[PDB]
Amino acid sequence: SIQTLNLDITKVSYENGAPMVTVFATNEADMPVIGLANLEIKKALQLIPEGATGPGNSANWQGLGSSKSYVDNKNGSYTFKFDAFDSNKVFNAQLTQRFNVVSAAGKLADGTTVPVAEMVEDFDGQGNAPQYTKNIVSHEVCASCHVEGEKIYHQATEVETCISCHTQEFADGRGKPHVAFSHLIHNVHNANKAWGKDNKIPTVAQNIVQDNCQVCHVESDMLTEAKNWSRIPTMEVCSSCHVDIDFAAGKGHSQQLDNSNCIACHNSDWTAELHTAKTTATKNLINQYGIETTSTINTKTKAATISVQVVDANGTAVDLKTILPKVQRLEIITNVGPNNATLGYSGKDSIFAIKNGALDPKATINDAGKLVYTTTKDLKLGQNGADSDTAFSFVGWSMCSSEGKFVDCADPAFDGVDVTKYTGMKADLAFATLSGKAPSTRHVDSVNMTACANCHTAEFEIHKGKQHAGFVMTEQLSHTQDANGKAIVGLDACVTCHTPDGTYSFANRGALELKLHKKHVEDAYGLIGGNCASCHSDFNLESFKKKGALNTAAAADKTGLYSTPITATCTTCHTVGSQYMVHTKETLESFGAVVDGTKDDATSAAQSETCFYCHTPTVADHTKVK
Ligand code: HEC
Ligand code: HEC
Ligand code: HEC
Ligand code: HEC
Ligand code: HEC
Ligand code: HEC
Ligand code: HEC
Ligand code: HEC
Ligand code: HEC
Ligand code: HEC
Ligand SMILES: [Ca+2]
Ligand SMILES: [Ca+2]
Ligand SMILES: [Ca+2]
Ligand SMILES: [Ca+2]
Ligand SMILES: [Ca+2]
């Protein structure tokens, strides 16, 4: 029943010596929550100030104990006492006092379900507001990539709880400097050294975080120590990624025996700039130029002509001739039937209209300075229902770049493997109809690029390398808004290649309905698990009525096997015959499904599935049945 448990420390009194701490618990409606059985002060701490343990040294949380002893006051308030407060006799009323309060997920007596809740609050030594803090990050940055409300590795769900246990005192006591949170946190996302008894190399963490300080260190008016990432250089933290320096021995660096002089040479401006220089320069390059793309069908030849207008940062026309020698690639992929693409991967129209400053002979720049390209593949417009009246064209492009500048592509044969030599630019999408009626467009209301950008950043150059320019997904290809009038950046353009017939092979589950699920259930399950909300605002179950067969397997002879579309969509994570699927192939067929059959059988059965008679999936609970 309870969706969110709010916790406030409303009162701290030292009038009896050891503090009495009152917590007030409210639900999402701000109603008092009575009967909490698993409330605890997980840690009582006080803040040793910046520099007190030595010149250049970090502020530290000194341990004062913990408590599970509390009275339920029957009004939403709970009052803690400490049986053994400050066992080390270090309590100092001149220091900031911190309390880390946790409520374990569980159930009240009446059976009301209660979610986990965690918080910290800081005070002075009399229970008033604090005079100074160590507020550098907030839990929210972790939720960008780790499912909110789930434990991150172990122990807790919020970074402040991690910080309250993984203290300098904790690390010193175990003779393990590396388990201090300010070392650990960088260590577990950086592949320069392994961590844990089993020496995990953080290959995946490294691939996502890419040492980008700004995914966790965010400037914030609520966090007065947010600039500590550049302002407090110490061998203890800087060594977490810089693993080959021995400061003591002067190996990899001049000898340093303490943190006294780090800041004298490692000025905040330099530390901040050097660690963010390349992502900032790339983002600046991406935002220099745009494209505006149109498509028309010649009603007699039934070929689409795509026109690309380059524009500058202010939406002002740039003649493509003026920048052609710096255009590394421009690719146009055209498919048909945006709700159920009809040409497959092999049948799609595709061209590198530009490669390393050279126009393909099939592409021209007109006197208006636009690129013009006409499809050559049969688009089969109108040959598969009303949806097949619409051709949709995905434009991806890249410009040659070195050290934050656009450069001439000096090498015609440059293969696009070295991604330091070019920038993927903003991709576009253009619709055209044979009939001259308004085009169909695919739904974009269930998943969008904002979800992707949480883990991959808004500057994600998708497929950048030898095969592709790299697609940057922006409002350039938005054709609808959400309830609040924000432009939706959909992945509808991706269907040009991620077709119901799959991609280059019938074996890859290349259909967009399957591919993102396949990739992320295999490689991102530690981050996502069953958390559909990581990509989905909702499920568009109505879209299934516009789908046909979906490619789900390759037969022995390399030909395509297909499933009815709901079965195909669910089976990506619930493989038939595996421990992840209770329904046998026979049972799925009894519910109207075709499972890895012919395209004709799957197509004929595509609207015969009874799955949604029983299954009532929501993003909150996709497992829900009658
Ligand atoms: C929109 C819903 C998303 C798109 C489009 C993509 N993702 Fe992800 N993703 C994540 C991890 C941890 C990996 C594996 C990294 C690794 O193995 O090193 C991936 C992988 C991809 C890939 C493959 C190419 C690449 O690694 O860059 C593509 C093309 C891709 N993803 C596109 C993490 C996340 C994540 C965090 C919880 C979210 C919300 C998404 N990905 C969503 C999308
Ligand atoms: C996306 C840009 C991330 C942000 C922001 C944070 N983390 Fe992360 N983390 C991320 C990835 C891709 C990985 C590798 C996961 C894997 O499956 O290998 C991790 C790893 C961790 C770990 C290690 C335990 C493990 O999952 O292997 C911990 C303890 C961890 N992350 C914690 C963490 C905290 C506390 C964050 C907020 C400060 C945080 N992460 C941000 C991706 C991202
Ligand atoms: C105490 C109440 C803890 C809280 C809260 C968190 N962690 Fe922890 N962690 C704790 C101990 C006692 C240990 C073992 C230390 C040792 O002697 O080896 C750990 C270990 C980790 C590790 C492994 C680190 C390494 O081996 O280098 C990770 C990655 C880790 N802890 C992460 C972590 C995160 C993200 C937390 C907040 C959600 C967190 N821990 C809280 C004790 C405590
Ligand atoms: C999330 C995965 C992070 C990324 C990426 C980086 N940092 Fe970080 N940093 C993070 C946390 C959760 C903490 C602990 C905050 C606390 O309250 O204890 C830190 C701490 C630092 C510090 C220490 C500051 C101090 O007062 O001693 C420094 C100097 C620091 N981080 C630097 C840093 C740099 C240079 C990064 C990019 C290369 C960077 N961090 C990434 C979480 C994350
Ligand atoms: C991992 C998250 C890191 C932490 C924590 C710190 N640094 Fe770093 N540093 C990191 C990378 C990936 C790079 C290369 C950046 C690039 O694009 O070139 C760096 C680079 C430096 C440099 C540049 C010169 C050199 O020889 O590397 C300096 C002077 C440097 N880093 C200093 C530094 C200090 C003082 C840190 C603690 C505050 C620090 N780094 C943390 C990755 C990470
Ligand atoms: C001036 C006399 C310095 C003092 C004192 C410290 N460092 Fe340093 N450091 C300095 C220079 C000129 C360089 C090379 C810069 C470059 O761009 O090449 C460095 C390098 C580092 C690095 C990065 C090493 C690498 O990437 O290979 C780190 C992490 C670093 N320094 C940290 C650091 C700390 C923590 C210090 C106090 C203990 C410290 N340095 C002192 C110049 C000076
Ligand atoms: C044709 C020019 C393509 C366009 C446009 C897009 N993708 Fe793609 N993708 C393509 C191929 C040939 C492959 C390999 C075969 C396969 O089916 O896996 C892929 C692969 C992916 C993957 C899997 C992981 C990877 O190999 O990178 C994902 C998650 C993926 N593609 C996503 C994707 C998105 C979101 C697109 C629109 C921005 C997109 N692709 C366009 C071919 C083509
Ligand atoms: C990001 C990595 C994703 C996660 C995590 C989940 N889904 Fe997804 N889903 C994703 C994409 C890119 C698409 C394709 C949209 C398109 O235009 O075809 C989908 C599609 C679905 C569908 C089809 C209906 C629709 O809304 O388009 C269903 C029924 C669906 N997804 C279910 C689903 C469930 C149950 C998940 C949690 C276990 C889940 N998805 C996670 C991307 C991602
Ligand atoms: C991967 C992105 C998934 C897609 C697509 C779908 N499901 Fe799923 N489901 C997934 C996971 C990781 C889990 C948890 C498994 C575990 O035990 O941890 C589930 C679970 C279900 C369940 C409950 C388990 C059971 O035995 O019944 C149901 C009923 C379920 N899933 C249904 C379902 C349907 C109908 C889907 C298509 C609309 C579907 N799932 C897609 C991961 C993914
Ligand atoms: C009612 C008679 C059902 C019809 C029709 C279909 N399914 Fe089902 N499904 C049903 C139940 C009662 C369960 C188990 C629920 C639980 O939580 O244990 C399921 C389970 C699934 C799952 C999860 C499988 C697993 O994790 O082992 C999936 C992916 C699933 N069902 C898909 C599905 C499809 C695609 C259907 C149409 C062909 C379909 N189900 C019909 C009940 C019923
Ligand atoms: Ca308070
Ligand atoms: Ca909280
Ligand atoms: Ca590491
Ligand atoms: Ca456009
Ligand atoms: Ca029907």
Numbering used by the authors: 45 to 670
Give the article text.
These processes evolved to allow the capture of electrons for anabolic reactions and the release of electrons from internal oxidation during anaerobic respiration. Thus, we investigated whether amber suppression in MR-1 could produce ncAA-containing MHCs and, specifically, variants of the MtrC protein, which contains ten c-type hemes.
The structure of wtMtrC was inspected to identify surface residues that might be changed to ncAAs with limited effect on the MtrC structure. Residue A293 in Domain II and E344 and A430 in Domain III were chosen, Figure 2C. Thus, site-specific replacement of MtrC surface residues with BocK has no discernible impact on the protein structure. By contrast, there was no detectable FMN reduction for ΔmtrC/omcA MR-1 cells cultured in the absence of wtMtrC. Cells from cultures augmented by MtrC344BocK and MtrC430BocK also displayed FMN reduction rates comparable to those of MR-1, Figure 5C. Thus, our results indicate that MtrC344BocK and MtrC430BocK retain the structure and redox activity of wtMtrC. A crystal structure of the homologous MtrCAB complex purified from Shewanella baltica OS18542 shows that MtrC Domain III, which contains residues 344 and 430, makes no contribution to the binding with MtrAB.
